[PDB]
């Protein structure tokens with residue numbers, strides 16, 4: 001059942017992850033609701049809608065509000081450098 005992958009995106013060629021996130025959390029969780037064309041995530045191809053977002057760049061997402069998750073993602077994406085996401089596959 002459990003299928004967890006860690007992927008690193010070098011954000012050299014992209015300005016945004018190109019994801020929407022829904023829900024919050026050992027009940028519930030933060031999920032990829034949608035993936036947008038021209039984003040780093042779509043280009044990489046490994047992360048899909050329905051994947052649960054666990055960790056971004058050693059910041060844990062498992063017990064975090066959706067509001068705070070959006071803030072953190074905006075903060076991370078706006079600064080230069082590779083982004084490492086750990087997700088649980090659907």
Ligand SMILES: CS(=O)(=O)Nc1ccc(F)cc1C(=O)O
Nearest residue numbers: 016017018019021070073074077
């Ligand atoms: C568009 S952003 O720079 O604010 N980054 C994001 C923030 C929240 C989110 F769910 C996704 C992104 C993104 O880079 O796609």
